[PDB]
Symmetry: D2
Subunit: 455 residues, 4 copies
């Protein structure tokens, strides 16, 4: 049901343990915007699972063995061998993290005016597509947009929407299909092997390329192992390798499922594209053999990807997130369902139904959570959606959420209990949560530095 950690603690990170009254002052000093809190003031930091993971003793040994050569580092060759074996692409180019790989892919693979279709999108990924002249098309199944619908493989592409696009626009006018595993925007929802194969088969008949956004591909493979018929005798490694067999390449943020603090990479099978990629990596990142990483980080990521293949590790990772979601759900706390691989999203609209979206319930709930528990969470609602700059109106998103994002191997079920118990107690007196109003709003990136006060 919930397994014990399949690891023990080698070293600890010291935290302050400041009490509620002091947390309230820190929160006020941050203008009630959790993005403005200092890391040294936070007990449990669930802002993101990106780059916040705990490394192993074996990775730290690798950290001492950084061959820092500008070209031809042994660590690059270790990374390259590892990704070829595990993902099964012919070619790999390291990048400092995922968005560096996305910049490269989109410049290489898009002609202005072409469509890129995907199972929803991530903000950086879609931006790089659009900056290169692509029009984005959502081809996710309709269910993915229903946040209360508890169904499996909610990240699946709708083959009919793909077909429709090909019929209406023409294959030559589609740059590529961008299939993300898992689907972050839908709450971390997995994609099935059947769907990946069906997309490979249809695109292949039309000469259309498919590139994966692989950042949480290991969480994805765990869902396939757990829930997809016929994958129960298959190892995580076998699943991961089969998944990528249905792609022409990928962009990877190692900062997620490769269990590192920095690192990413671009893969492809096509020799000519690989050649062009090497011509471009040097402009933005570094050499084809470091790509904006220290040798020690290529080493840490090579070791971390291989650790991520262990079944017990990934089972525990996903079930720890599930434990938090299960406990919240059992107390009647409204969440996005089903719980995804990396986070639990509170539905702040329903949590704070005495407040209007214009009063920023997700922002305000995230502040309350920090004050009551020392937990930092991310606003993923009206604030982070930003303001229409043509009209000056808020972009008003359907999802008004607080993201409890879980770094890998950092926290225990007891820290999950701190988070849950705190949220449950807040829920019991939810009507007491107050609305927020801007007191400082920057013109851009407002979620990063906006300051608020209570209404």
């Amino acid at each position: 049901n919930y397994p014990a950690e399949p690891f023990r603690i080698k070293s600890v990170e010291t935290v302050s343990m400041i009490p509620r009254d002091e947390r309230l002052k820190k929160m006020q000093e941050a203008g009630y915007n959790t993005f403005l809190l200092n890391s040294k003031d936070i007990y449990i930091d669930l802002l993101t699972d990106s780059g916040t993971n705990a490394m192993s003793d074996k990775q730290w040994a690798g950290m001492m063995m950084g061959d820092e050569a500008y070209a031809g580092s042994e660590n690059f060759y270790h990374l390259e061998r590892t990704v070829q074996e595990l993902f099964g692409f012919k070619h790999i180019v390291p990048t400092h993290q995922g968005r560096g790989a996305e910049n490269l892919l989109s410049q290489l693979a898009i002609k202005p005016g072409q469509y890129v279709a995907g199972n929803m999108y991530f903000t950086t990924t879609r931006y790089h597509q659009e900056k290169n002249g692509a029009v984005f098309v959502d081809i996710v199944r309709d269910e993915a947009h229903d946040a209360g619908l508890n169904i499996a493989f909610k990240g699946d592409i709708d083959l009919k929407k793909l077909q429709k696009l090909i019929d209406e626009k023409g294959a030559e006018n589609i740059a590529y299909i961008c299939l993300a595993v898992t689907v972050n925007l839908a709450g971390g929802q997995p994609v099935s092997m059947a769907n990946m194969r069906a997309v490979r088969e249809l695109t292949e008949a039309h000469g259309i390329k498919v590139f994966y956004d692989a950042t949480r591909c290991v969480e994805n493979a765990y869902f396939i192992k757990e829930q997809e018929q016929g994958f129960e005798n298959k190892s995580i490694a076998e699943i991961v390798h089969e998944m990528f067999s249905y792609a022409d390449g990928c962009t990877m943020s190692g900062k997620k499922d490769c269990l590192v603090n920095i690192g990413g990479f671009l893969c492809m099978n096509d020799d000519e594209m690989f050649s062009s990629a090497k011509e471009l990596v040097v402009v933005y990142e570094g050499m084809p053999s470091y790509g904006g990483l220290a040798g020690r980080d290529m080493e840490a990521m090579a070791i971390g990807l291989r650790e991520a293949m262990q079944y017990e590790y990934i089972e525990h990772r996903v079930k720890q997130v599930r434990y938090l979601g299960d406990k919240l759900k059992a107390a009647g706390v409204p969440i996005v369902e089903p719980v995804g691989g990396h986070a639990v999203f509170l539905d702040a609209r329903r949590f704070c139904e005495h407040l209007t979206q214009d009063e920023f319930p997700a922002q305000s709930l995230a502040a309350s959570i920090y004050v009551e528990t020392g937990v930092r969470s991310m606003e993923r609602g009206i604030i982070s959606a930003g303001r229409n700059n043509v009209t000056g109106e808020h972009h008003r998103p359907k999802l008004e959420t607080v993201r409890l994002t879980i770094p890998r191997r950092v926290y225990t079920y007891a820290h999950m209990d701190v988070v849950a118990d705190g949220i449950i107690k807040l829920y019991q007196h939810k009507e007491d949560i107050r609305g927020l109003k801007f007191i400082y709003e920057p013109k851009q990136l407002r979620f990063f530095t906006a300051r608020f006060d209570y209404i």
Copy 2:
């Protein structure tokens, strides 16, 4: 309140795994049914000891990169020295590689052949160093410390009536010193009260008798005082620690326990002449007074760790994590030493195995069976550890025949505790399957470390 979450985050991890029961069976036999003789790789959760098995912090690992390895004058020595002077309040410090190295120095320096050393229950290496330097050991702990099931507070306390009697019957000049350990390891990690430390100092001082503390789990002990002794609820852990040592003439310390390191110890004293003599001796056994058989980076880690240990939330969690395991075991009717102590839960082997005699080594055997059935390693703390009476040659016979589930600091979670509890509860369902043991190889001293047995 009852069970707080870890007051830290995980910075790095070590993988854990379990070999099949069939393989464990083979390994237990190959180790001659002594858990000390199993290999680390063959252990799933290793509760052999809290000694040297602690997880260090990121700050201690940063100190590890700043090892100043000079033979004399290292910054890491000065940092250790001023930290221990500040926190414990003794005048002088001599580092040693670990606690038994400091006990070697103390016993050689402070005992004349034929004298008595009186202590709140024996300890294994401690008693051996006393006895090998010609002392007779006298246990002056309260009787109640030897009754496993008796739930009373401050079980580690010295019985003043027994101390008084020793002085009367033997004369103060024939007592080398009082050895006061905090907490008391073999009583189950049981604390000593401040009132008792103060009373002991007062009695011994009037008679000119020296008192040397075994400081190895003094922070755990300070936690119990803050939690349970009336008047201390408001004092900081650090204030408690400093007051505790104000009632002593010096101490031995294994830093491998409450200083949160993997190696390290020291000897403290207030007396200038003893300091001089201790330095002459340290060079023979350990190294120059300026490193004491430690790398500079380990002095640094030990200085940093001892100060980390003073954080209330850290030590509250440390002790309550142990308590949680004991609570779950108790709830299922598993017999344990009570109350639960600072560093371990001690299964009561006499009750766990009523069908065996103490001469059939129930504790040694239970530890074997726990490993075979669960892949958890635990330690014998009974008749084998007690050693032999150095006059009659018979086994010492402790009332406490226990198996120790010892918890390294900052290493495991409550989920690991639940795994351990579950496996022990299961084994209890068939306790009568645990077989008697007999010696096949017996070392001449500290026999428990490497002795080998076979089933009767």
Copy 3:
């Protein structure tokens, strides 16, 4: 005086070794005669670049254990931020993963298509980011910087007459900014004087033109100012650095050079609106303004390293070690760029190989031959690096056709320098054996990194 000993001790080592000439020959062919394409394992002493190849200190490694990996609000970000604010004197900082990431931001933010960017000699990635954002590059370095053998001080200085002419012929509003690099890498690591920085600021300020520094080797540059510019002999390295940047509106920095790290860079500016815009852009390419595509531990290492770099003895030794190699080479009549610069000795390939034309790529070829004969890796810094004229499609033709023996900071000793000098002197004895090269594979930009050749 002339050649000081290392002002540090060795804390840890990496082994070095040499594969036979026969094996090196094979490897050079397999790398298509481009030194960039050899493997690290196959190199004995690796002088390809001083970029990212530096040895960190014990203090920086201690900072590496204290990485605060938070996505926003990391202590390591705050430490970097206040360090750069203190030492460089700019209002705002945006970290980037390395220097070309900061050049991406600057060029996008500060250039309107069709504008001119004027600089003290081009640099490779710098010129590409200017040109790809629609700028025309204009070289305003003094003519003497392009003559390898001419031994004059402060060769990096901007020719004010050329700057003045640019403003006259093109109009100030059509100049996006002046790019002033310290030191000037491709001139041979040549410094810029304070007087010149002050004069440039004065001229540009009167016309409303912005000046952005390439800060990557500013500490080396400050060393030359202290050593050679009248009036500065008494100022600290840190004072020199802070004054230098007071003449700028912001900078790009590759921390991989003078900040003594293996990864890292940043963009600084004084202007609030530019800061806002830079943050919008950083999120697209690098990461959140609060880490900029760097682990927290690398921000920390870069903060610590930049402050280490201000120690006079450290930078005096850094530069004199380079000078020693150049001195030994000169003494034996080997043709080099003079005076020797801050980070490398640059062999003059035109003189080393008089028998070849620049169209036959003497520098690329010499670098190949050095590796084959010595197992030392060096870099082409000539016509291949210069790239193509983005209007005519012809090779840019630099007067400076050089091969760079680039010295990573705190990595090698004088004995390694002597090994390098000895091997190069030997190769010089048969310079006429070095054969012309021709392209077999040419990338569309920054071609030198991965191009492959074959002998004519």
Copy 4:
């Protein structure tokens, strides 16, 4: 002649660089006793080569992999395998450093009244022999006592003295022969393979055991490679293994030739002695599988011993010391000859022949060296010999020396030049060096804390 370092620098240790005037104050604050200087005030620290070595990147990787189990650590098994392969003993017991191993050996191998004979002695080694009731007998060749005699293998035992001892005392009355490699007291002098075999053969015929003090056995093996006929096609590893084939066991300080900062061990071939050793290690050190070391240090020492077998490494180590001695000798500076493996010893008696031994020329020369260069060196003369406590007279040693002891892989030839140039300049005006007199003298260990002032 002098090779370049067969390594490059991975990381540096920061030092203060304080100037001459400030060094003079530090020296005065230390009462002119270099033992009292703070490490943070010293540029180049030549006090000892014990435990001061620079580790490699590979050792630091091993430092991150410490299996800290109290019993059965993987690191112990790695150490054990390595020592068995390289030294060729059947059994190994780890100890925290060399004197811990000596305590164990002497308790195991000596009955009160027995003789232990050796090629000179080391202070801790001889003390442990004597505390256990042994009488020490020097059986080194007479030449070893002539400090100006430049001959090879000066550490050799005189077989005739050994024979004489057996004849006069009886084999049953000799506990063992303690053969040290190299011989520290004679200036770091090596012992020949011929001598080790001859001693093995004579002792074997009489049933007498031989235990090596192996602390600088790798320096020793380098001398055999370099100078002993017939060892020129032999690897350092082959030499080391043959050396120990002539012993019944050894005590080792890894802090010397195993390239670590802490660590040591005891080896033996005899099963019964191994059993007894395991019974004793637990009293003083720890378990047979950690012996008073952290698991990470058993790992560092296992990796370091194997690194020490590399020919280029040990050739450079010994020749760097030689470089310093050669340069001093060429300027006419009086030194113990020939230069040993680990240090250069200045003859302070001849250096300061205007001073009497009672004026402490070695102590005073060591102070001058620090003041002029920031180099710390060790007094090895009348001060470190101590005072006769029966009579109160100085012990007056024949050797009045300053030891310039070189840690492995820490310094370069340039640092050797700082040391040499400074000493040479002092030598040029040697008559200016002033005598010292006590102002504070402890009753014991006076070299550690005595304070002086100028006469």
